[PDB]
Structures are given as structure tokens and as C-alpha cells.
Amino acid sequence: GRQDRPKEFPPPRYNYTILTRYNATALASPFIVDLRIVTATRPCEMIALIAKTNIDSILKELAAAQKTYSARLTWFKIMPTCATPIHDVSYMKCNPKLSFAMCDERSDILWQASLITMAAETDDELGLVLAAPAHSASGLYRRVIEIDGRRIYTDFSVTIPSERCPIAFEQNFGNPDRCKTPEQYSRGEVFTRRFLGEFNFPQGEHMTWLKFWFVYDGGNLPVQFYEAQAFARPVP
Amino acid sequence: QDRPKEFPPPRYNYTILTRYNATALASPFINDQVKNVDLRIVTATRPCEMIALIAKTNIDSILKELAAAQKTYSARLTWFKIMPTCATPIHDVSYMKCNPKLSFAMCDERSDILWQASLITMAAETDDELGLVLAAPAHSASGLYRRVIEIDGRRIYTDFSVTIPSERCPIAFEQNFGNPDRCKTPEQYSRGEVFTRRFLGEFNFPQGEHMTWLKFWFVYDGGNLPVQFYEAQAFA
Ligand SMILES: *[C@@H]1O[C@H](CO)[C@@H](O[C@@H]2O[C@H](CO)[C@@H](O)[C@H](O)[C@H]2NC(C)=O)[C@H](O)[C@H]1NC(C)=O
Ligand SMILES: *[C@@H]1O[C@H](CO)[C@@H](O[C@@H]2O[C@H](CO)[C@@H](O)[C@H](O)[C@H]2NC(C)=O)[C@H](O)[C@H]1NC(C)=O
Ligand SMILES: *[C@@H]1O[C@H](CO)[C@@H](O)[C@H](O)[C@H]1NC(C)=O
Ligand SMILES: [Mg+2]
Ligand SMILES: [Mg+2]
């Protein structure tokens, strides 16, 4: 069945409008937290950075306040001296009675360009799936959710084996053009629109193509994407 | 504004060999035969245009010879931007099991369809797969583009001199074509070190789908879509 390209896709959860012109403010610095563990046990795994957040607490506050809000989602890979934004979306005109990112408007759906065919958001748009990342994708990933000025942080400690994966692709996450120093964030000099590419397919279609491309390359699709576990406190 | 759901039917059903690794890229620097390369002119006079790099070749005469020889054949298509000290490959496809009774690239097999990752959403092949369309390129995309068609060991060259207004296009994206990571010196080519699989990304949509999405995305950004694409005029 791997031959047949898909032609029907899950219907989107909400019909938004993409404001192609919207110039977001400079990125708030990611250098300051809930820590999740993601470790691959084999080469060429499809891994999932998924983690629930007590955010519906915040949206109930906004919903009772009868206030529609703007928000923002950004994924960073954190290096020892810099941080690379790899996925970024701005949201506006959100009804707080709905789920996050079910908003009337949004910026371009922005990605590090070489990630387009190797990554996608999960169904609730808050998680990130990586198809066969290389060993160099090991490290620390930080999800920053911005909702009405407040910021929720989630860290993912990701382990990829060093055995070569024949379908992996080197992402050079630490290249200085995309790996921004703490100063560049502080001076307000980091604008995702300038160096991240757009890919405005809805998540349902992006994910559908990611799975089809991965299996077509010979990957083994997991039965189920699982929430990344919190770091395990020791057992006496 | 409403997303496309019907696409032109493909010219030919082909199989993509995702594992295939082409041999190193032949140097595009043809210092010896600089004088006789078919050179075309392509100029935009307003910002944010969609331009086409189209040029007929004598490829059909080569295909007739192979057809008379009943010779199933291999072939390669590669586009470069030629800078003064290096050359950036920006699109690359290898073709195998080619039936010489058909048109170029109507082949039973091919490699991944490779692009500079940041071009995916801003470029696409034309219907015969030999031309190249750029949607809202920036001023820095001005310059010399060289198309290298390799067929049964033979190589056909077409050069395009492209001019883009200096005024900033608001929907354009900087491609950093001159970056050493992707712009390769003549020595790197001669030493057999340039492997497109290493550093170009894939976009395995058939041309008809890629071209359809390209047009829809351009128009959605407020681009003016030209009535039709024309062959570039020769240097006169
Ligand atoms: C998003 O938009 C689509 C298309 O406008 C909606 O699907 C249509 O919904 C209307 C009203 O119920 C039906 O009459 C049509 O038959 C549906 N299909 C089409 C092709 O128009 C879809 O329900 C919308 N979803 C949300 C969450 O607003
Ligand atoms: C096949 O193409 C790959 C690029 O996708 C080349 O990979 C690198 O080649 C160099 C030199 O041979 C090695 O030092 C690297 O370790 C290779 N990378 C990986 C990820 O293995 C490869 O050289 C090509 N195959 C050849 C030339 O036989
Ligand atoms: C491609 O294959 C489908 C069947 O999967 C067929 O119906 C279609 O006609 C084929 N296209 C061409 C151009 O042969
Ligand atoms: Mg692939
Ligand atoms: Mg756009």
C-alpha cells in the first residue's frame, strides 16, 4: 500500500486565515521548568515531543473575562551558547472557549526550511514529531507557549543513537545564522520571518504527508504517539 | 484564497528511489567552452513578479538517436546559480530507466526531487520539467543561472541572466545563494566532493501539484499571476 499517495486528509479543527504580511515582534529570549525525556532506542525512529500543560486553567480565566487573546508557539533547540528557533507560529483573535491555536488568524506557519519534510505538529498543534532525526539532533529542545503575555515552558531532553540512519538528514542546528546568541535575543534582533521558511499546509495535511514520506522511505510508523514522560524521581 | 483540491494529471507514472545516491556533481564551470553557451535574458521591471526560466534545446534530436539505438538510458537535471567564486546547485533530479521514445524526464525511475530547502515554496518546475519558475524572488536572486542537462554522458548547457529590481519585495525571501555551505568552489567540484543528497532537501510532489501549490501560494500573498509563461529571448 506504500505506493498510493494519500488524497484525503483529516478535516481541520478550525478555519483560520493566514496573515502573510504579519511581522511579529522580535522573539523573547528563551534563556531563563517541566522536563520531559525522549530517547530513541534504534536508528531512524519517528519521535514525538508531546507534553500536556495546565493551560486550560489560563483559558478559563480568559473565557470568564470575555476577552479574546493573541498567542504564540515557538520551538527552540538549545545549544550551549545559542538557541535555534525551528518552528514558530503567531496567533490572533482567539476565542478562549476553544482549544489553543483554534484562532481566527495566524502568521505564516514557520519552520526551519530543511525540516519541512521531516517534522510536523501533532493534532492539537502543541507537539512536534521528528521523522528519522540524525545523531546530531540529540540535545535539549524547549517549547515556549506565549498566551496573553504569559509564558509556559517545556523542556525535552532528546537522545538519538549515533549509529548512522540512512534516511536521516543533517540539520546543522548550531549554524550561527540560525543559532542566535543570548545577546541577539536581548537586543531584539531575532525575527523568525527573516530566516525561517513558511509551509502553510494545515497540520492534518502536513502530518499526513510526513507519515507517507517516512513509510515510503522504509520507516516503521509507531502505532501511537505517546506523551513524553517526566523525568523519573528515584525510587528508595 | 480557497485551497486547490484538483491537480493536473501527471505526464508519467514514475517511481522515486529514495535510497539512490548520485555520483558527485560534474563541475558547472566550463571555462574552456565559455563562448558558445546558449545564453538567455530574463528581466523583471516590477517587484514581486513570478518569472520563468524557459529555453528550448536540441534534446529531442538526442532522444531520436537513442530511440533508433533502442537504448534505455540514464540522465540528470541540475540548476546552478553561478557566483564569481562558487556555484550553488538549487535543483537536482537523477533519472533512470528512461524510454527514449518518450519526452525527457518521462522515465520509470528517478531520485528524490532535490531543491534548496528554502526554495521549495518559492520555485517549481515547468510542465516539461526542464524549465524553472521563481515566485517573488528578491533582488539578491539576480544573476546567472546555468541549466545542466546530462543525457547518456552528453551535457547540454543553457544560461539565464536574470535581473530583479532593487526595491524590496514584501513577500520575497532571502535565499543566501552565496553561502559557502551551498555555494561550491571549482576545486570542490573537481575533487568529486559535491553530493546534492548531502545538502539539498527533497520535495517529492509531482510537478503538477508543486506548480499548483506554487501558484496558489503566490496569489494568496497578493502576487499578480501572469497569463502565461514564455521562452526567454536569446542574448541579442
Ligand atoms: C471549514 O470550512 C469548510 C468549507 O467552507 C466547512 O465545510 C462545509 O460546511 C458547510 C456548512 O456546514 C457545508 O454546507 C458544506 O457542505 C461543507 N463542505 C464544503 C466543501 O463546503 C467546514 O465545516 C468548516 N469547519 C469549521 C470548523 O468551521
Ligand atoms: C553518498 O552520498 C552521501 C551523502 O548523502 C555521502 O555521505 C558522506 O560521504 C563522506 C565521504 O565518503 C563520509 O565521510 C560521510 O560520513 C558520509 N556521510 C554519511 C552520513 O554517511 C557519501 O560519500 C556518498 N557515497 C559515496 C561517495 O560512495
Ligand atoms: C498512473 O496509474 C494509475 C493507476 O494507479 C492510472 O489510472 C493512470 O492512468 C496512470 N497514469 C499514466 C499517465 O499512465
Ligand atoms: Mg527522504
Ligand atoms: Mg507566502
Coordinates of C-alpha atoms and ligand atoms in Angstrom, one line a residue, chain A residues 20 108 198 200, chain B residues 217 221, ligand 5:
Chain A
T20 CA 1.0 36.6 5.2
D108 CA 2.8 32.2 8.4
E198 CA 7.0 29.1 5.5
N200 CA 1.3 26.7 5.3
Chain B
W217 CA 0.6 30.5 -2.6
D221 CA 0.3 36.6 -0.9
Ligands
MG5 MG 3.8 33.2 1.3

